[PDB]
Symmetry: C6
Subunit: 65 residues, 6 copies
């Protein structure tokens, strides 16, 4: 929405390394390649499709905006 | 959102420290910088975007007046 | 709708309740207010609880059902 | 809801004791007093409102048609 | 939409294929799909229990199906 | 949509993938088919996986992205 999109898009455009924490406790790390209404593609060695419904928090490695 | 929006907006506007408990049991702390229909941006020692679907409760450090 | 009048009765009559979360945690207090997605619980700890994180709402006494 | 509603209504009307297992593993028991799109009211000692999103299964104590 | 799910469940139902339904909490239910709608599946063995799809992780047939 | 073309690439190229569920369980195989709500995973035993129970889809090798 009005916050989530610009936030993720800024992270995407600025290629900021992020830590994505899943609801189960697992921590994912990488950079946001792209995202749509339901998923986020996290890129590194091999990219992976993360369902937003499985995400708890997105923590940037450095301050943004 | 007749209650949620005014509540979160008051916490935000008044810089009220809050504790956000996640469904998995993890406790997040800080002040609400902004929010929308699905996420809340928390800031202080660790700035982060929290998905509401992962939140169980939001406990203000002090009660909120609407 | 049954959820709304049920909650409104608990609210209006200031009935003490126990709100059990999906993670097993038990919250206690009286419902101060609520909307489509959240419930504001108050007494010992004032907090906004997301309904999506609630498993059950158990009143301390029987109440008029809708 | 061509199946859910008739099923729950049958259990409600016939007052069939049921076991409602929650997604977290807890087992609730009693009779279905009523239900709507999102919740089910279960009666035992005091009635409790159960959110369907927290329910995994509804198991009747005896078979029903 | 349901171009895969519906035909899949209906085939399992019509052919009475033994199936295992794994829930998100880890529970494994066994039996056969007797019926289903948009939100639930009726699984039959000892008694027919209603399973909410939201609580299901996977549906695994006892044998391949076409 | 980003999800559909991505899943379709995995499907068409028959790419080996790991599907991690929200409860931490790891499933392996390949995407045989999918619709708006489910994915058909093929390996030693085929199974229908509900997307709501999936946390991440990880291919065994880099693939073309949407």
């Amino acid at each position: 929405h009005s916050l989530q999109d610009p936030y993720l898009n800024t992270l995407r455009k600025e290629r900021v390394p992020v830590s994505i924490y899943l609801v189960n406790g697992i921590k994912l790390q990488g950079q946001i390649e792209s995202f749509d209404q339901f998923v986020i593609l996290l890129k590194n060695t091999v990219s992976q499709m993360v369902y937003k419904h499985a995400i708890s928090t997105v923590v940037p490695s450095r301050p943004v905006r």
